[PDB]
């Protein structure tokens, strides 16, 4: 069954929200199934005029409080981040309380969507509703540069412990949990903390369904995949944690230097094992994978495993299988 899922576009003072809206409107399959609500903060007149010119194709709402926010002593340079957090709190409150929608896909104004962006969320929304171990579906692959993704598998999806944002679906139920403790600033890194995440994962793709414009190297998928016609049961936690983990640890192990230099090419899928924070950093860097960690979680990591393509080979940068939780001190 098809479900109504609003798209909440977060805008402020960039006239290029035009490019974001033009792509969303071009690919939208139904205005009824995907109403677009553009929440504009900042009161930038030119941007307001641009949004208004779309007329009824979107609903334009305006964050009401344009005042400066009192910041804490360590944050004089970060007024903008306090304003962003205030805008998200207000806009999500509008989509879930005033409009009373059951879920929403949050899209920053500098994101261009892929042709199957809507199909992807329509197909994954039922997974999010049914699996309490998931808390979001994201269009973003943090290691999604062209040379690091398999273009022959545009349909492949994964679970990740690293909340990616950048085009993401959440349920009204999650907003009910987050709203009472919403932070003053740095909302996305706050969601990445264990006190918020509570061990929950997001679905993310092999090839990103959003790309930033105006991170710049992430490749936007251009081959339409009919996700609603595919069997996505493999993403259920019980199946995924058995099958994907058996796949990762069943793969032959190779030293990082051998992967880097393309040795043993007959092995199309391998595992590079790291044992501590220093080796994770070093190995990630050697293979061109993002090496920063938020609350101890690596970008696109799942049970500590970062999966990507390297010189055409599938690689799993993984901890020993005795892994049992993230350590926030891995900074």
Look up the CATH number of the domain holding residue 26: 3.90.550.10
Cα separation of 191 and 244, whole Å? 25
**What residues contact 188, with CB distance under 8 A and at least 6 apart?**
163, 165
Cα separation of 88 and 179, whole Å? 10
Q: For residue 23, is it within any domain?
A: yes
What token pair was written down for 160? 């990740």
Specify whether the CB–CB gap between 303 and 317 falls below 8 A: no
**What residues contact 257, with CB distance under 8 A and at least 6 apart?**
286
Distance in angstroms between the alpha carbons of the first and the last residue of the chain: 44
Single out the residue of 21, 231, 226 nearest to residue 126, CA to CA.
Answer: 231
Specify whether the CB–CB gap between 200 and 135 falls below 8 A: yes
Q: Is 122 found in the same domain as 13? A: yes
Specify whether the CB–CB gap between 167 and 240 falls below 8 A: no
The secondary structure of the chain, three-state, reads CCCCCCEEEEECCCCCHHHHHHHHHHHCCCCCCCCEEEEECCCCHHHHHHHHCCHHHCEEEECCCCCCCCCCCCCHHHHHHHHHHHHHHHHHHHHHHHCCCCEEEEEECCEEECCCHHHHHHHHHHHHHHCCCEEEEECCCCCCEHHHCCCCCCCCEEEECCCCCCCEEEEHHHHHHHHHHCCCCCHHHHHCCHHHHCCCEEEEECCCCEEECCCCCECCCCCCCCHHHCCCHHHCHHHHHHHHHHHHHHCCECCHHHHHCCCCCCCCEEEEECCCHHHHHHHHHHCCCCCCEECCEECCCECCEEEEEECCEEEEEECCCCCCCCCCCCC
Q: Is 297 found in the same domain as 198? A: no
Domain end among 167, 200, 215: 215
**What residues contact 310, with CB distance under 8 A and at least 6 apart?**
148, 259, 287, 288
Specify whether the CB–CB gap between 78 and 70 falls below 8 A: no
Cα Rg, the chain, nearest whole Å = 20
- Residue ranges of the annotated binding site for substrate are 14, 41, 87, 109
Whether 188 is catalytic is: yes
Cα separation of 39 and 58, whole Å? 10
- Cα dist from 94 to 6, 41, 45, 83, 138, whole Å: 12, 13, 22, 16, 21
Q: Is 259 found in the same domain as 166? A: no
Cα separation of 121 and 5, whole Å? 8
Longest dimension (CA), the chain: 61
Query: What was the experiment behind these coordinates?
Result: X-ray
Partners of residue 307 on adjacent β-strands: 316
Q: Is 182 found in the same domain as 83? A: yes
Q: For residue 233, is it within any domain?
A: no
Single out the residue of 274, 270, 282 nearest to residue 307, CA to CA.
Answer: 270
Cα separation of 46 and 253, whole Å? 56
The one catalytic residue among 13, 188, 189, 241: 188
Specify whether the CB–CB gap between 305 and 270 falls below 8 A: no
Q: Is 191 found in the same domain as 92? A: yes
CA atoms within 13 A on the CB side of 243: 10
Q: For residue 237, is it within any domain?
A: no
Cα separation of 267 and 40, whole Å? 51
Q: For residue 224, is it within any domain?
A: no
Cα separation of 201 and 292, whole Å? 18
- Residue ranges of the annotated binding site for Mn(2+) are 110
In angstroms, this model's resolution equals: 1.5
CA geometry: angle at 46 spanning 40 and 47, to 5°?
30
Q: For residue 130, is it within any domain?
A: yes
Specify whether the CB–CB gap between 202 and 160 falls below 8 A: yes
Q: For residue 108, is it within any domain?
A: yes
101 alpha carbon, distance to own chain's centre:
21
CATH of the domain at 257: 3.10.180.20
Residues in the chain after which the chain is broken, C→N over 2.5 Å? 214
**What residues contact 154, with CB distance under 8 A and at least 6 apart?**
206, 207, 221, 223, 225
Residue 116 sits in which domain range?
Answer: 3-215
Single out the residue of 67, 216, 202 nearest to residue 136, CA to CA.
Answer: 202
Cα separation of 154 and 156, whole Å? 6
Place of tokens 């105006």: 214
Partners of residue 309 on adjacent β-strands: 314
Q: Is 184 found in the same domain as 264? A: no
Domain end among 215, 235, 269: 215
Q: For residue 227, is it within any domain?
A: no
Single out the residue of 41, 30, 25, 23 nearest to residue 2, CA to CA.
Answer: 30
Single out the residue of 324, 287, 283 nearest to residue 304, CA to CA.
Answer: 324
In the chain, the number of structural domains is 2
Phi then psi for 117, rounded to 5 degrees? -55, -50
Q: For residue 241, is it within any domain?
A: no
Q: Is 100 found in the same domain as 181? A: yes
> 10 Å Cβ neighbour count for 215?
12
**What residues contact 325, with CB distance under 8 A and at least 6 apart?**
none
């Amino acid at each position: 069954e098809l479900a109504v899922i609003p798209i909440l576009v977060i805008a402020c003072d960039r006239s290029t929200v035009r490019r974001c809206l033009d792509k969303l409107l071009h690919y939208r399959p139904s205005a009824e199934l995907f109403p677009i609500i553009v929440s504009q903060d900042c009161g930038h007149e030119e941007t307001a005029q641009v949004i208004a010119s779309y007329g009824s194709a979107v609903t334009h709402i305006r964050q009401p409080d344009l005042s400066n926010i009192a910041v804490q002593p360590d944050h004089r340079k970060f007024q903008g981040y306090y304003k962003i957090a205030r805008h998200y709190r207000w806009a999500l409150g509008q989509i879930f309380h005033n409009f009373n929608y059951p879920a929403a896909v949050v899209v920053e104004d500098d994101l261009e969507v892929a042709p199957d962006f809507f199909e992807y969320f329509q197909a994954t929304y039922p997974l999010l509703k049914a699996d309490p171990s998931l808390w979001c579906v994201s269009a973003w692959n943090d290691n999604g540069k062209e040379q690091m993704v398999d273009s022959s598998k545009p349909e492949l999806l994964y679970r990740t412990d690293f909340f990616p944002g950048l085009g993401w679906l959440l349920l009204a139920e999650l907003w009910a949990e987050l709203e009472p403790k919403w932070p003053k600033a740095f909302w996305d890194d706050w969601m990445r903390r264990p006190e918020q995440r509570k061990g929950r994962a997001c679905v993310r793709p092999e090839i990103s369904r959003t790309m930033t414009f105006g991170l710049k190297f992430i490749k936007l998928n251009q081959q339409f995949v009919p996700f609603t016609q595919l069997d996505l049961s493999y993403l259920q936690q019980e199946a995924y944690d058995r099958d994907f983990l058996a796949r990762v640890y069943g793969a032959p192990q190779l030293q990082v230097e051998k992967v880097r230099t393309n040795d043993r090419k007959e092995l199309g899928e391998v595992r590079v094992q790291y044992t501590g924070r220093d080796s994770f950093k070093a190995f990630a860097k050697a293979l061109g994978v993002m090496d920063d960690l938020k609350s101890g979680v690596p970008r696109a990591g799942y049970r500590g495993i970062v999966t990507f393509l390297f010189r055409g080979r599938r690689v799993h940068l993984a901890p020993p299988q005795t892994w049992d939780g993230y350590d926030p001190s891995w900074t």
